[PDB]
Amino acid sequence: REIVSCQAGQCGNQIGSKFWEVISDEHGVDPTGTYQGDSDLQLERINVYFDESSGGRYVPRAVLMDLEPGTMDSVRAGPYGQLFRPDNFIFGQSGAGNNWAKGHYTEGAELIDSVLDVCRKEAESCDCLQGFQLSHSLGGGTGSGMGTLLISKLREEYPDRIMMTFSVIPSPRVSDTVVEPYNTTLSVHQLVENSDESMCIDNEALYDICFRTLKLTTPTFGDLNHLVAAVMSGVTCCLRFPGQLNSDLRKLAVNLVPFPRLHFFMMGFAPLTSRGSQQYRGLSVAELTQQMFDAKNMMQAADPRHGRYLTASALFRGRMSTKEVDEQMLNVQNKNSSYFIEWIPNNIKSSICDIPPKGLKMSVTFIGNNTCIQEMFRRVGEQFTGMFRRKAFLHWYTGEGMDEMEFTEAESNMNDLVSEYQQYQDATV
Amino acid sequence: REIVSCQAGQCGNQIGSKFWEVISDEHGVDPTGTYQGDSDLQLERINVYFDESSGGRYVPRAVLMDLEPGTMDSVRAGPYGQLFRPDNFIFGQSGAGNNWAKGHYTEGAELIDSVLDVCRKEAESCDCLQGFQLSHSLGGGTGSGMGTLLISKLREEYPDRIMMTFSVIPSPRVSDTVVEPYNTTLSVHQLVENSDESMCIDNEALYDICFRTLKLTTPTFGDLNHLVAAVMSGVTCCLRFPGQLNSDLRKLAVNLVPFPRLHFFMMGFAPLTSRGSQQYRGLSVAELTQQMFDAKNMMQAADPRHGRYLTASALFRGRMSTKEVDEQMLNVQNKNSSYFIEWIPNNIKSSICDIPPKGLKMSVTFIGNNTCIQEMFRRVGEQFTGMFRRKAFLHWYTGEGMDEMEFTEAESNMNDLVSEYQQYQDATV
Amino acid sequence: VQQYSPGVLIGNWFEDIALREDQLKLYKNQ
Amino acid sequence: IDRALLFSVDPVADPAAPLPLSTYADTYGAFYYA
Amino acid sequence: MREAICIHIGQAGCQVGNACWELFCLEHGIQPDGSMPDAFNTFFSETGAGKHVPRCLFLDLEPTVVDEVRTGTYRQLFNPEQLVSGKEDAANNYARGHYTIGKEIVDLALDRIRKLADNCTGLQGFMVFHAVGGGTGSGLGALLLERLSVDYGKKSKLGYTVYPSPQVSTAVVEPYNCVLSTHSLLEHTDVATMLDNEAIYDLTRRSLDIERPSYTNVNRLIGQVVSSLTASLRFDGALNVDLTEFQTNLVPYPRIHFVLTSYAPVVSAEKAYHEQLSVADITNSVFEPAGMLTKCDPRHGKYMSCCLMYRGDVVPKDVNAAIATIKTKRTIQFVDWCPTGFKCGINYQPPTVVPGGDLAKVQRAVCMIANSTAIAEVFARIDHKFDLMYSKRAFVHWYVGEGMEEGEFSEAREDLAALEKDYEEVGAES
Amino acid sequence: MREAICIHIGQAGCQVGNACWELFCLEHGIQPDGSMPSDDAFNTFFSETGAGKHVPRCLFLDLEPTVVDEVRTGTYRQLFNPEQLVSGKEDAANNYARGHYTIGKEIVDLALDRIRKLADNCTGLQGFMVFHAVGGGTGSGLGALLLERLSVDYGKKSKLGYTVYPSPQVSTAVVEPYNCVLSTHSLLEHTDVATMLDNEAIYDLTRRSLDIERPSYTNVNRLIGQVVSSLTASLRFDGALNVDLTEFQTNLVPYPRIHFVLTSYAPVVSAEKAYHEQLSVADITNSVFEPAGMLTKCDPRHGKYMSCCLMYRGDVVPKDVNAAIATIKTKRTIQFVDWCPTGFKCGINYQPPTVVPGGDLAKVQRAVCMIANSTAIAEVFARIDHKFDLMYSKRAFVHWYVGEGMEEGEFSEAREDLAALEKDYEEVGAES
Numbered sequence A, B: 001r002e003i004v005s006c007q008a009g010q011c012g013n014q015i016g017s018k019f020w021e022v023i024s025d026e027h028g029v030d031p032t033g034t035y036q037g038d039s040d041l042q043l044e045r046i047n048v049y050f051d052e053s054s055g056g057r058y059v060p061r062a063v064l065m066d067l068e069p070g071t072m073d074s075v076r077a078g079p080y081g082q083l084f085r086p087d088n089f090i091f092g093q094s095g096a097g098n099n100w101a102k103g104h105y106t107e108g109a110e111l112i113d114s115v116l117d118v119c120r121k122e123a124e125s126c127d128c129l130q131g132f133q134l135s136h137s138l139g140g141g142t143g144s145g146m147g148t149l150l151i152s153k154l155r156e157e158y159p160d161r162i163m164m165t166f167s168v169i170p171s172p173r174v175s176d177t178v179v180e181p182y183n184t185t186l187s188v189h190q191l192v193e194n195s196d197e198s199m200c201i202d203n204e205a206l207y208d209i210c211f212r213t214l215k216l217t218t219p220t221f222g223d224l225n226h227l228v229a230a231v232m233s234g235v236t237c238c239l240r241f242p243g244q245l246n247s248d249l250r251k252l253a254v255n256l257v258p259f260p261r262l263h264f265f266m267m268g269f270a271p272l273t274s275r276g277s278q279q280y281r282g283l284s285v286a287e288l289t290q291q292m293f294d295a296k297n298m299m300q301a302a303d304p305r306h307g308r309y310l311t312a313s314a315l316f317r318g319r320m321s322t323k324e325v326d327e328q329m330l331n332v333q334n335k336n337s338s339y340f341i342e343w344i345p346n347n348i349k350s351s352i353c354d355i356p357p358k359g360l361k362m363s364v365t366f367i368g369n370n371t372c373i374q375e376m377f378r379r380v381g382e383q384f385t386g387m388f389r390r391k392a393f394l395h396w397y398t399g400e401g402m403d404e405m406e407f408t409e410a411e412s413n414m415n416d417l418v419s420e421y422q423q424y425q426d427a428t429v
Numbered sequence C: 001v002q003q004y005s006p007g008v009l010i011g012n013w014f015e016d017i018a019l020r021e022d023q024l025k026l027y028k029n030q
Numbered sequence D: 001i002d003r004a005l006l007f008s009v010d011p012v013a014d015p016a017a018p019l020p021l022s023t024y025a026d027t028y029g030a031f032y033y034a
Numbered sequence E: 001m002r003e004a005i006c007i008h009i010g011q012a013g014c015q016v017g018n019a020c021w022e023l024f025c026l027e028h029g030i031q032p033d034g035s036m037p038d039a040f041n042t043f044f045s046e047t048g049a050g051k052h053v054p055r056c057l058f059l060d061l062e063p064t065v066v067d068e069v070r071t072g073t074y075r076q077l078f079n080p081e082q083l084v085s086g087k088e089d090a091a092n093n094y095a096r097g098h099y100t101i102g103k104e105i106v107d108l109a110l111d112r113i114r115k116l117a118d119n120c121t122g123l124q125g126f127m128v129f130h131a132v133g134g135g136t137g138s139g140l141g142a143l144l145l146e147r148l149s150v151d152y153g154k155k156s157k158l159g160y161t162v163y164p165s166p167q168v169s170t171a172v173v174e175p176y177n178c179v180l181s182t183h184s185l186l187e188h189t190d191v192a193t194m195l196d197n198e199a200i201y202d203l204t205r206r207s208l209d210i211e212r213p214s215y216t217n218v219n220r221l222i223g224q225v226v227s228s229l230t231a232s233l234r235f236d237g238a239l240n241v242d243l244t245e246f247q248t249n250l251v252p253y254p255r256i257h258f259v260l261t262s263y264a265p266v267v268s269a270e271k272a273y274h275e276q277l278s279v280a281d282i283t284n285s286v287f288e289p290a291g292m293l294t295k296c297d298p299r300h301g302k303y304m305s306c307c308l309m310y311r312g313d314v315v316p317k318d319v320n321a322a323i324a325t326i327k328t329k330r331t332i333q334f335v336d337w338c339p340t341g342f343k344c345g346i347n348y349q350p351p352t353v354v355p356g357g358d359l360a361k362v363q364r365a366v367c368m369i370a371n372s373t374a375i376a377e378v379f380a381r382i383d384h385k386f387d388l389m390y391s392k393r394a395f396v397h398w399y400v401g402e403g404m405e406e407g408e409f410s411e412a413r414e415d416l417a418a419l420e421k422d423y424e425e426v427g428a429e430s
Numbered sequence F: 001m002r003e004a005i006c007i008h009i010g011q012a013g014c015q016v017g018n019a020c021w022e023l024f025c026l027e028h029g030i031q032p033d034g035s036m037p038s039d040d041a042f043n044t045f046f047s048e049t050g051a052g053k054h055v056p057r058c059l060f061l062d063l064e065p066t067v068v069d070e071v072r073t074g075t076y077r078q079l080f081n082p083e084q085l086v087s088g089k090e091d092a093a094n095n096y097a098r099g100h101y102t103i104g105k106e107i108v109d110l111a112l113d114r115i116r117k118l119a120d121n122c123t124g125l126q127g128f129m130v131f132h133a134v135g136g137g138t139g140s141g142l143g144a145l146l147l148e149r150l151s152v153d154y155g156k157k158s159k160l161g162y163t164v165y166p167s168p169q170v171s172t173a174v175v176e177p178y179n180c181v182l183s184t185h186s187l188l189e190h191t192d193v194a195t196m197l198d199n200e201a202i203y204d205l206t207r208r209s210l211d212i213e214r215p216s217y218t219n220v221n222r223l224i225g226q227v228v229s230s231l232t233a234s235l236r237f238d239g240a241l242n243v244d245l246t247e248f249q250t251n252l253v254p255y256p257r258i259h260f261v262l263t264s265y266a267p268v269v270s271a272e273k274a275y276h277e278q279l280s281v282a283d284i285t286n287s288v289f290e291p292a293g294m295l296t297k298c299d300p301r302h303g304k305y306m307s308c309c310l311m312y313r314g315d316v317v318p319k320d321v322n323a324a325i326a327t328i329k330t331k332r333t334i335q336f337v338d339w340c341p342t343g344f345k346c347g348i349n350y351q352p353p354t355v356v357p358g359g360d361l362a363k364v365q366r367a368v369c370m371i372a373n374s375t376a377i378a379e380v381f382a383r384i385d386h387k388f389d390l391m392y393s394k395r396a397f398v399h400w401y402v403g404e405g406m407e408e409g410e411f412s413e414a415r416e417d418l419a420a421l422e423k424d425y426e427e428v429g430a431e432s
């Protein structure tokens, strides 16, 4: 029941930092490394994420990994930076420069050997690993290229372990770089073959959440990272805590991956109510269900109405009646059977833990393999081919040591990956 | 372990005088002779160069020699001149006339008996004498001839003792005597055949440093004597003061020349700097090492690039870590394998002294024998032979007691020395 | 190369002014 | 010119500065000195 | 880390760099003597005495400006070395600054640059400052760029070049110098940035509201823009963009590296507290043709790529809103094959004001570096001037007797023609 | 009882011994005055006096006074005897010849008399721990002479020579290969166990483990002192599996010629790294066995291990050391020689290592010193003798050795038995 985490790039480092400082708060871990919790269920499975030391300190089983050293300096300057293991801060001298190859082929390849060394050193100390978690962004240069290099490298030595990849993938309205298309098209297929299932986060859905769902006039990246870390922590809730109807990452994979290549998911979380609406809203799983399935409450910039859900799962946390929660999942199933796929009965999945996050009597993490990822992948592929037709910005890769053939192959990889979703969504019995 | 100094000729007398102010002030001795240093380290080895008086005054362990009383007048009129013992003052009435014959055969021999009486008494006062040192210029017969005459019978009855000697070989650029090549040729063969080491000072390169590296308005002979005095202090700093890895004159001689014939060195001091860099450039081992291996700091004007570093040694001064002192001289090993000779592995000797020169926190003296130390001998031989084609200025020597064939013997010694230098320049494994 | 008095900015002048300044510093110390 | 000015980065602070203690005294027993 | 070695070539680059280092010292809290009573590492090296010195090389062929520096209030800051001055200038002659006077100083300049580079373990870029209107910054600039690219290799190079304006020009042979140096800038300049004088003059007249602005004000604006550009690597921020980070976005092709620069809000104290300092407003002023530092109307062209770098208390939100409004409004049109087309680099350190200056203290600022197809206009202007002056062979014996063949001018003209054709081709639709 | 004599030869040996005695005084609580402020565990190194004062059981022996004078004038003036710190008047000058035939003879008799004085007070004398460096003159010449006389007048008394051999690329002198190849004579014929302590490995270990960019000989000698304290602690204190000098020697050294044993030590961490790494004995042993945590520049993987001595200090337990031993045996990177599958010594002590104030070592409750004999050591000797042959091919520096009363064929004899050492290393490394 052990998972070891890795953060790649600036985005990965920040998101993993926030995830670590929320999971340590959940487990009652001092920023200095000691224990200040009041409950025993935390210490029962604290070993899943924190490695105990001879001195009684619980250091995160995390590998911080970024070519830029400024991100390492910032994460150490953070309030929970001293918690992290010092020799896990593997960093280069020159940044990747928003390039695929500068993190995946030439500079990352030299750096990645020490990362594999330290990662397997952490792995061996565990009795047995459930698997490897990665947090990165295909939008970033080193977050995408070098993270995908690690993705490829772990498979050849850990074939039958879960690979939980949390990527942060962009959209043009909040596109902060002009190399988003290249950096995601060259990255998608590494996730395709070399990850058992990847759960994706969109930048713009998070801003939509903060503006419309939570009514925040000043949400920052720190504000966004906790919302992402909510799912980051709720995915492993059954791992870390006892459950009335427990589950795990292998449970989620086997229950949400009917066919091997359909393993890209969209995320949802609950509850998400603004403080003003928090007063007048009764915190119950009954309302948490429409918070689960609501369009603007989603963590992906793809409207569920356009797509059709293949398989979805729900991780409930708290003290709720499994009776009522199961009948609610049935109710949403038969209320919108058109949205779900007909030839798989009970497309929604129930999993019930006991421990909810801090202060929340009840919480929900939603996982969904909706076909609406078709829109997002098709549109980003169109963005790619728009400049790929003109041989523009491609000189960086060609000079750095990359060929045209793999470019064409990756474009074909999205083409025949995204071609699946419409022909599974329009299928008839 | 102690050293008895001797100052031959006007140049030798002034250079040694400057050496004596620098040594006295470094050890804490005022010109009056009493001790005012605030450190026990100055006192604990004040016996290397200073003898105790009945009243406690520190008298220099030095002897002065000339054929002109004016040099004694100037030395006594100097700021620290009255420090010297009076019986050590040994002067003649008629100057040598820049004639090696007068300096060595007739006028010098009349006074060398008293010179040896003074030296023998001085050594018997010395408890366990580590060696003698002589400072002289080969251009003038007063210092060259009489200095070689002194060496000839100092080594006769101190055979197993170190004979340090600083020979100022004049250069054609700063040539100011026509019998200069005669005196140089007639002194060099005694100097080489009858000394463990014999190391070089060049007035041309001293001016080159004062013009290009150190950049003064009016650097007279005093500043040149100051640099020569500082490097003279540095060559025995390790003997007079403790350090991480200590050495002495014998200790450096036994590992600075590979063969008894080849014992001519070239100088070095760091850091030499002007007001445009002393306050700006950080004082560090990197700066010291990079300034130790360029001709613009070298104070002998034979270009080391055309030669091969047969052996070199570096006497560091000041509190400094012990890796870099030879890590950065492993860097030169690796990067200038052409400059360094092949069949001597690790051509660099390194010593570290805790006490830096007064007024500096970091220093180093560079003393090494190369194959480019052959060039000034070649050019002196050219000039000597050129005047010898028709016995130019030869009657002044042959009418003073010199035989014609002694010049042939000196020329043969020059040919042997230059051939030896070139054959170990082009020697291969 | 003809030498010019201090105050003229051709040749070694910056080092000359620095040297005069540090001379003044040493003299005042004494 | 003056040797201290010629060789010292600070013409007045360097030559008046005290000599540094030997590494033996600085390291091997400095904590006993306290 | 994040190391950027500054090079100033000639009179123009020297004054610009003087202003730039003024701004750097004021915003890093470095006194003129060189001490503060590790963000400075990229521009200042810290020695054992606790003092910091700039990592810049002034390189002029005439000594008046460097003597002004060496006699100014910043004597104790700049190194006495890395301050190379020749004895006779190029005198508005690219051939004289590149072939005779420049050849006897380029070796020493390279030695000084190597000394600077050996001191830095994280060398990321070179910030060249010159004006191709003159002779020194054109010829010696070309020679220095050629030698630096030959030796160091693929190290990032950013040449801030003050091109001669269509109308306001201080010398006659400036078209010749610019045309001759364009070939060298194209071959060994990773990113070249326009710094035309008329745009800055008009900007100061209308926005800074200065009746008689001067070179001091122009150089102050240039220092502001370089500080805004380098702040991303200097300080922490939400979107930290390094030199290569934003270089991989302005250069779709090696022949496409000439960019326009713009800064906002360029306002005085009086209007700072009458106008609304919203990020959307500042971005709109940036994209407005008036609010730009290059005399080049963007409406007659069409943008290829953009980089907005925000300084201060900005947030990604209203940056997103500004981007969305820019996409929605059709006044400024973008290339079809760049849907994204935007770099967004956010930094948390608000701009500092030089005391006695003209820019006011402001909580937020925007610097836009844009690669556009409108850049062909200034090249057309300059090569039309070159053709008019070349028609009956003026100012040519000066270059011929200096060691340059008459065919070099023709080769440079063909290079400009090819560059214009390439700009038109990449700006052409499908 | 368990009583040993420390000998320091050369100024390098003097530095190493002073660091060692610093560490010993800290771990026994003996103040520099020589009195414990406020159990017989110091008797192995300190001698009781009727006044309650403790005198270290060490002899300093140098030819130049420029280090012993400071030792006398330093912090331990009251601790160290003014006697027993013998220094000559003239240095050996990197000469085996001078240290063994010119100045060594005139002081070796007095050194042997001082050894007599040290030993007559020893009721239970056990061994002689001699610290020196073969790079210099007196570390080679006088060290050779002293070892010869000690072997003659002591028979089979235990000798542990901690010697600083020339490191591959970092070395001080130029005649240092000469000195090493000449001193190998005595270090082979009159040394029971020899331990290489070259400087490159210690430098790199400090730079990659202590996270400090400017250590020095201070830190090098501190690490050497930690190592020697780990060696001596088994007999100095009680433990689960104590090992004495002969105890580990007779089962570390397989053949009389083969007694050159390479060492390592772990864990070694800084203050800010101390409270972050899980200091399990298994991981500590892995850091021991990996090449970068070693005090010698000799990578084990090019050779085969044939004896190991792991000596743990602290709160380790037998079913903590045996698990680590099993993991090491199973792990493929290191190859044990065929004839001795066991090949392991397990010493355990209940006293955790002490850290000197101001030192770079961090206070750790567990440690282990590795004393391993392997055929991989052949590479350092094949390097040093190759250097010596390359420099001796046309008689460089040989004039001093000849003219200091020393013959010409001893160089031939030294290269003879160094070649013999090369070939016996390769013979024992060859599979049966």
Ligand SMILES: Nc1nc2c(ncn2[C@@H]2O[C@H](COP(=O)(O)OP(=O)(O)OP(=O)(O)O)[C@@H](O)[C@H]2O)c(=O)[nH]1
Residues within 6 Å of the ligand: E009, E010, E011, E012, E013, E015, E016, E089, E090, E091, E092, E093, E130, E131, E133, E134, E135, E136, E137, E138, E162, E163, E164, E169, E170, E171, E174, E195, E197, E215, E216, E218, E219
């Ligand atoms: N932006 C800006 N441009 C300047 C400045 N000073 C001069 N220039 C430009 O530089 C060109 C040449 O002016 P100069 O004084 O001769 O300087 P230079 O660049 O060294 O040219 P030469 O000395 O002739 O080689 C002018 O046409 C201006 O356009 C300045 O302070 N700021």
Ligand SMILES: Nc1nc2c(ncn2[C@@H]2O[C@H](COP(=O)(O)OP(=O)(O)OP(=O)(O)O)[C@@H](O)[C@H]2O)c(=O)[nH]1
Residues within 6 Å of the ligand: B244, B245, B246, B247, B251, F010, F011, F012, F013, F015, F016, F091, F092, F093, F094, F133, F134, F135, F136, F137, F138, F139, F140, F164, F166, F171, F172, F173, F176, F197, F199, F217, F218, F220, F221, F224
């Ligand atoms: N471990 C260690 N080795 C040292 C130290 N100082 C010097 N050495 C080694 O000693 C070798 C040379 O011998 P020296 O230190 O000079 O001592 P020595 O044998 O008396 O030789 P000389 O002093 O020249 O007479 C060098 O190659 C160094 O490797 C030290 O502080 N610690």
Ligand SMILES: Nc1nc2c(ncn2[C@@H]2O[C@H](COP(=O)(O)OP(=O)(O)O)[C@@H](O)[C@H]2O)c(=O)[nH]1
Residues within 6 Å of the ligand: A008, A009, A010, A011, A014, A015, A068, A096, A098, A137, A139, A140, A141, A142, A143, A144, A168, A170, A174, A175, A176, A203, A221, A222, A224, A225, A228, E238
């Ligand atoms: N959640 C989150 N995402 C970020 C943050 N900073 C950047 N990103 C995302 O990362 C993308 C750019 O990645 P980049 O910074 O270049 O990553 P890098 O190249 O690995 O350093 C943008 O599209 C953002 O969506 C942050 O602080 N939090």
Ligand SMILES: Nc1nc2c(ncn2[C@@H]2O[C@H](COP(=O)(O)OP(=O)(O)O)[C@@H](O)[C@H]2O)c(=O)[nH]1
Residues within 6 Å of the ligand: B008, B009, B010, B011, B012, B014, B015, B096, B097, B098, B137, B138, B139, B140, B141, B142, B143, B144, B168, B170, B174, B175, B176, B177, B203, B221, B224, B225
């Ligand atoms: N560096 C230095 N060189 C000198 C000095 N005095 C003379 N020389 C040079 O030494 C050479 C020999 O002259 P010198 O030995 O003084 O003549 P002597 O008086 O007969 O011994 C001359 O060519 C001078 O140029 C001095 O004080 N310092």
Ligand SMILES: [Mg+2]
Residues within 6 Å of the ligand: A245, A246, A247, A248, A251
């Ligand atoms: Mg289950």
Ligand SMILES: [Mg+2]
Residues within 6 Å of the ligand: B245, B246, B247, B248, B251, F011, F064, F091
């Ligand atoms: Mg010594």
